[model samples]
Target chain A: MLSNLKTGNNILGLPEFELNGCRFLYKKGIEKTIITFSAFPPKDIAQKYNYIKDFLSSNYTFLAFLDTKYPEDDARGTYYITNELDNGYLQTIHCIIQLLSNTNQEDTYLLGSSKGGVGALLLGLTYNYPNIIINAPQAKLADYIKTRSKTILSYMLGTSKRFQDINYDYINDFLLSKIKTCDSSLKWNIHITCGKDDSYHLNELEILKNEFNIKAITIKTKLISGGHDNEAIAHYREYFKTIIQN
Target chain B: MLSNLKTGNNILGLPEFELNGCRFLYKKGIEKTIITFSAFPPKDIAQKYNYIKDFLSSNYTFLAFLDTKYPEDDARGTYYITNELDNGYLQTIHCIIQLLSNTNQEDTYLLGSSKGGVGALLLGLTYNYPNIIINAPQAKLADYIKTRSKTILSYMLGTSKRFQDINYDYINDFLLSKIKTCDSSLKWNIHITCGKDDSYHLNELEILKNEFNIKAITIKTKLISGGHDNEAIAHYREYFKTIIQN
Candidate 1:
């Protein structure tokens, strides 16, 4: 039997489920809310979620904050870099609903950080509902393209080619500098907390986010510690205090 | 017939001759040696040569520069953006030489600037002796490729297109990052100069001048004045002094 909810620190009690074709500890319960956290990649998820699942089972209904294994199934065409499709994350929800048919929960919450925060916001859009939380979520693809980094995008995207002149095809000259992505409907209840000293430029990325003209969803943009440093991570106040006070 | 080399600064009485693809003008009996200049998008070698012919006919000898009209020739192609190779500059050079052979006098000197400089230098290597001068030549193929300035190279030149994803096609990447020079015999004389405040950088334009292995050629490199302003044109004195006094 699952334990009842209280205001103190509650551990999540997770069972197992598959995400993007990767197995992970997933948990669900019948309560006032469904809080989902997409965290940790494959290896870390396996260990951490097992502990959280048991706690969440008693207090909250949710999906995942981590995945225990790599999404090997996402590589069907060798072109799919990361398995999480921006538009298709909800397909997984369909499967989850099939598993949790016996329970009754409606108000759901989605949460994540770093890459997981990316997944959470994306999945939140997939749900198009009022309960999504993003911590230090990155908003645009332009900054990523400008900064020098090695990624599987080229291998997957088939952009490798030699140009005779410095033109848009070259990294320094690539045209169509930004990707369009503002239509996702999470702004109503979407909360994004980032460090002012965000590891990446937050405002520049937000320029992309704010410019998207969709439902007038107001995204709560908060600046935490000066930036993306450990101090930034450590200093942000937890909102649980407000919940308890309320 | 061109008049005898006029003495004194009459400047107007300089020996002027239009022969080959250039209209060369020189100071009469000044014996001040030679300095030349030219710009891109080939102009009327014959008519523009008249200007050089006009100037050198009074103050200098062996003043050679391009007219920038050759690209208009049916054979020339749009090199910067269009990958068309319809116009062969090599043919234009042969035409210039044939004209020069028919009506030439005094010691010949050569010079060109920018793309014209590239043409000048390439010709200096293939043709018989004469001092060659170039300033701020657009020589780096890779700089163009990386920046997409030379989009035509991407479509036309086989090796040039390899610059797209630098990692996988790094062979082309490395190769494109360099400038190619023609083999000149020892005693080949060339002077090159640019502004001290080099503005457009990552330019592989002048790198080869310092290569240790090259010999049998005299190359003088200079960085002059504030940025690339045309006012830097005055610094041509030292280089001119070298050609004139030596």
Candidate 2:
């Protein structure tokens, strides 16, 4: 399924291509560009691609990165990385950005949710993209893996034993460290939304918020009434529309 | 997008073909065969294809029919019919059945929801398939079109004026009439599920139930707690699993 989509085939009239170790679906538009890091699908691959299909009709250049790392459980992909393969997730995304963006990084917007939300924050902050939108993001990977996503933790570290090893830090704080090291001089227009009832992710959000405060960075945050799922994103549609249109 | 999918391309490792103006995605399995009519998507074509992706991993042969009739709203398709070109909707489905089914209709199960539900009920009854499963189906077309789906009504009849022409009767109760005329001798293992809160559809279901009672046809009905959407179908997952696995 992943191979068929990655083999330079046009999906829904847009071209799909694989560069380095990442697969991309690109739709050219008139002006602004939105690079989407897809969330972990409920079942198979490309399920979250439908989440942003409405954006295709607008004059925004849409480039979606399909997370094809996990081949298990019918290719339910997220994070766009795995320890088993030579994952060029970040490099591939950067390459696509350079190839597709006609204007400066100011014209580009990075969008994602859940696992993809973590990707968007990491990438958007590191790359100095002006616009970043995320919902229900896992700020701390280790906590997320231990509590909610054990399979991914196993896949990332290549073994459940490695995850259980208390001696190692497990590279779970990778995103937090990335945030700590990022240049504070650059201004980022970040919009963050999450479900109010999502206690685990809300705690992670608090951790990130403290880090942002330490870095003297400001972000727009909205709390909705739901749990950690697409329904929360659906509730944020109006805000999403406002951010994009502006 | 429809053309790309229809031109003998492989979608998610499954072969797709266009026969008699209807496009189909077929997955072969070991024993039982499921003929699925896809529900109307929120956006773009093949969105509901994900609904049955779980069934693909099973040993059952899965065949899904994509509704490509409406070109408006990013090809948000349902009903598998239109007033425009020659549409061999039923013919195409019949042809696929003849080509794919190794066993008799007794081993085949027809499944759908909403618009596709109406299609399944009509087709399953007409063809004498033993198993038929449906959820939140619109039993009355004219009432549904006028109240809910005006765009589809316009596309189906080719004009709003035609729909307003009071003398015409509007071919609205087509499914009901089809049900009234179907062979009464054959026993159908039919399962129907719908949302209790969905008033319009519930009324339609009531109408159908009365007709079924009059026809002396027995069917298993399950009403869930929700309105008209995919979430209701999600609630019926346990029953769905039970029916399929049995």
Candidate 3:
């Protein structure tokens, strides 16, 4: 009962099922739609689908993901899509571009926490979106691999050449630095948050704040009280509400 | 050389040496002593002395680990520690205990990441320890074995008994539950963190929170950016410094 879908809060009493190779909780919003990237270890989207749902407000219709894709189970949709050996994120980007055709990119927003935050930032920065919000995001790809527990790096990075020689300094200079230099004509409203207690980047976020400002990007930074947790987003609720209404 | 220690950070410029069963980065602290459980995929502590050494803050003497304890590594280490057989954490508990006879259990602190996080938690819980810090520790032993991309689970849990017949819920209740009811007198000052994007444990963590709170245990939780990666602990500088300092 616990591990299965019978438990936890299914607020909408919405049917729990898979579509297009992903497991999702879809709440029909009248005006707009939001796509989400779930945080790491994937909280069993089938069972804990509601946690992703909880983040959404009624202003925008919501679709949440456990992962971009799980080959073993088609119903559990993907975060990165296809799980390609390298730059799988590009596959996810392609999927999002196609999804945009169904709904105007102007009406769609990207949201994520932690790992999802990484995915969310990647999606929003690489492409263009109206509004993107992330909580406690990880910036450097190599720092993630070199520092965190070894299992995740081994499991996720298995045989990915793109990540082979990548390091934090390189990611910061090459990948993250490019975000600010994006085509200036493309307008995006970005809101990012992290706690003063952030375990990974207390200093890095400060650095990012300065860099984004230098680029004159339409990005707003919020510093909260706690480290990196859902609590950091409690303050962001009003932001979500404000954005969705517009 | 890639898996070896010589590649990473060795800021201490401290001696790179080996004694008895392990290669280590020893930081002589004036007060307490801390022993770390190297995270999975083995960071090769002997070679990458800085990776393990980064966790220490000069508050305590530190010994970074190389998980040289493969089942084949020698008389000292293990692949999964004996926890694979019985209360597997004991392999680490026994291994660490024998390594130092002069140190009291109270003075010793155990640390790990990912697999090591699981190991540190198990060792500290099953035995008497005052401090244990882990990053993205797995809670359900069977769930970990049954899910998680198959390779790691199959490779490690092939020898464990509970894994042979277990489902996730069973392990969640039976295996994880046991950690809460540990020797009541053995109080652990535990600090742990994970991301919502965690590819693992979206639901398991929810369950763990309930069980830990129900048991009225004392533990500090830190949620950080990124998924299962070690980035979760990047900003925990104060926590690391304070723990070592004390």
Per-residue lDDT tens digits for candidate 3, residues B1-246, read 002223344546654433223445555564456666654443222323224445444555665554444334322233234423444334333333423223556666777666566656666666556687666766666555444335433444456677655533444344364566776555668777676577674465566667677677767886667776545556443455566565
lDDT of 3 by residue, A100-160 (tens): 2235666777777666766666666655565787777665654653453344334444465
Candidate 1 is graded, for docking, as incorrect
Strongest candidate by TM-score: 2
User: Which sections of candidate 3 miss by over 4 Å?
Assistant: A1-12, A16-21, A41-59, A68-103, A145-148, A159-181, A210-215, B1-246
What is the per-residue lDDT of model 2 for residues B69-99, given as tens digits with 9 covering 90 to 100? 5545545554554443222355446545644
Off by over 4 Å in 1: A1-13, A33-58, A65-90, A97-106, A142-151, A158-187, A199-201, A212-215, A229-237, A240-246, B1-246
**CA lDDT of B100 in candidate 3?**
29
Write one digit per residue (lDDT tens) for candidate 1, span A1-246.
012111233343234544334333434455433434443333222323312432342455444534323223331121111322122234334334323323322255555554455555554454344555556644543244223222323332334365322222332212112223334433356666777777574764365355433335555666777675445444432532133123
Compute the lDDT of residue B149 as modeled in candidate 1. 27
Whole-model Cα lDDT of every candidate shown, in order: 0.41, 0.68, 0.53
**What tier of docking accuracy does candidate 3 attain?**
incorrect
TM-score of every model versus the real structure: 0.35, 0.46, 0.40
The best candidate in terms of lDDT? 2
TM-score of chain A of each: 0.60, 0.85, 0.69
